[PDB]
Structure 1
Amino acid sequence: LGLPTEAYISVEEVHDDGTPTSKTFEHVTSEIGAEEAEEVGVEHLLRDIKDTTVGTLSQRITNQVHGLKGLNSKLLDIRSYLEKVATGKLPINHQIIYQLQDVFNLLPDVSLQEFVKAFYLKTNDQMVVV
């Protein structure tokens, strides 16, 4: 569950919110790409343990299960950090925390009548084709 890289950078700031400043390590998004030669080598190496490219229903359902598992793991990590903050083992950030609050605000809010009707319409429209 997750990529094997985590790129970190050094940031020196004043923190704005009246807190002591330190070297720390700011985070930068990381992703694993490849070039033509490395891609060819990888494809040759993993030609015996590679899943077929194409959305076979088996692989789609497995991916969805994997995404549910990843969501559960991320939520568990967030909950553990929240428990640590509440118990005081770790400091209340005062930042990023309100990022979690924004996440909780962005919840879909299903069971609204209009959305329910639209979603039923879409489900029936797909089921007729099925």
Structure 2
Amino acid sequence: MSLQHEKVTIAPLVLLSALDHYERTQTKENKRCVGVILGDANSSTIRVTNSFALPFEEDEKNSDVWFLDHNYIENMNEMCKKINAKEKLIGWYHSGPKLRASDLKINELFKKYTQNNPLLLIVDVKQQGVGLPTDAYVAIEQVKDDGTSTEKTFLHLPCTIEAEEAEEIGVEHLLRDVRDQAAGGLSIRLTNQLKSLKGLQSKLKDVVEYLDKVINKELPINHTILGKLQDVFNLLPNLGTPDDDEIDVENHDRINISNNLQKALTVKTNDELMVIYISNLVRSIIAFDDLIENKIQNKKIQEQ
């Protein structure tokens, strides 16, 4: 297979075309649809260039009973190679909004079809998460904590958007909103700072409830999540160390640069005030000159 597949670059086409597949088959209300994702691979950066529906069927009696059509897959590959020689099999999207354990079995089909570990792409089309509209997952095999076997699992990777050139042009054009975040003026970033804080708290909350549930409601102890928290606590700045004390001194120094900068604009303003009080002075002269001139024109009619 392939080992390098670490970051997943995602065209803006992909999120919109998966969205369209869901609603143009009238699969809704958690009837899932499976389509392929084509693109390039065999390398760290994974580009999903194009996406298309496949035929799929699902059962609600046992959930590990399904139909996937292989014959359509064969025909798709033939057709699209000619369109672009940049579309080859790189995995499959799963339409979401959630990861199933049934997607573990469906994955073994796509692992056979293409010699790379196949990307599972969750396209959240129901958008109940404020972040992550795309999640990227590559199924891998690893030996699993608490004395347990080599188990099949899905490991999350970066699910980034960076966009293609092609894509950028339609994206900005359709856009006519001031964007969720753009980070332009000071107004946008003052909003952003406060948004970030709500952001930090929301992730952290779910973690509180995980630790509670290990010791009260017996979900199995996964030492990777406990270990990450150790690392979090060792990169936590401690007050009264030399590192923290420095932060305080630097705040005085940056605020000295700001103090001066605010005063250097009073100078700019002060130039304007004088230019307007000069302008007003000229309008005065103009006004008097006309009042004199009406007499000269009154006199000219009597004169002649």
- What is the TM-score of this pair, normalised by structure 1? 0.84
Q: 2:237, 2:244 within 8 Å by CA — same for their partners in 1? A: no
Structure 2 CA distance for aligned equivalents of residues 14 and 55 of structure 1: 46
For 2:198, the equivalent position in structure 1 comes to: 69
Q: 2:183, 2:189 within 8 Å by CA — same for their partners in 1? A: no
Structure 1 CA distance for aligned equivalents of residues 196 and 132 of structure 2: 14
Structure 2 CA distance for aligned equivalents of residues 54 and 28 of structure 1: 25
The residue identity in structure 2 corresponding to 1:22 is: E
Gapped regions of structure 2 (runs ≥ 5): 1-129, 259-304
For 2:143, the equivalent position in structure 1 comes to: 14
Structure 1 CA distance for aligned equivalents of residues 182 and 159 of structure 2: 24
Based on CA coordinates, which of the two structures has the bigger radius of gyration?
2
Gapped regions of structure 1 (runs ≥ 5): none
Aligned counterpart in structure 1 of residue 178 of structure 2, from 50, 72, 85? 50
Which segments of structure 1 move beyond 6 Å, counting only runs of 4 or more?
A: none
The residue identity in structure 1 corresponding to 2:192 is: N
Q: 1:10, 1:23 within 8 Å by CA — same for their partners in 2? A: yes
Pair 16,117 (structure 1): closer, same or farther in 2 beyond 3 Å: closer
TM-superposed CA distance for 1:23, in Å, is 1.5
Within a 5 Å distance, the mapping from 1:3-42 to structure 2 comes to 3-15=132-144, 18-42=147-171
TM-superposed CA distance for 1:116, in Å, is 4.6
Identity of aligned residues (%): 51
The two structures, once aligned, show a CA RMSD in angstroms of 2.2
Q: 1:9, 1:25 within 8 Å by CA — same for their partners in 2? A: yes
Q: 1:3, 1:31 within 8 Å by CA — same for their partners in 2? A: no
Pair 53,10 (structure 1): closer, same or farther in 2 beyond 3 Å: closer
Task: Name which of structure 1's ranges 66-75 and 15-24 shifts more when overlaid on structure 2.
Answer: 15-24
Pair 120,32 (structure 1): closer, same or farther in 2 beyond 3 Å: same
Aligned counterpart in structure 2 of residue 102 of structure 1, from 231, 235, 247? 231
Q: Deviations over 1:15-53 (max 9, x none)?
A: 37631232221222211121112111000011x113495
Q: Deviations over 1:66-125 (max 9, x none)?
A: 11011010111111111111213411112231111211221111x215345422221111
Query: Is the partner of 1:27 in helix, strand or coil?
Result: strand
The residue identity in structure 1 corresponding to 2:249 is: L
- What is the TM-score of this pair, normalised by structure 2? 0.39
For 1:121, the equivalent position in structure 2 comes to: 249
For 2:275, the equivalent position in structure 1 comes to: none
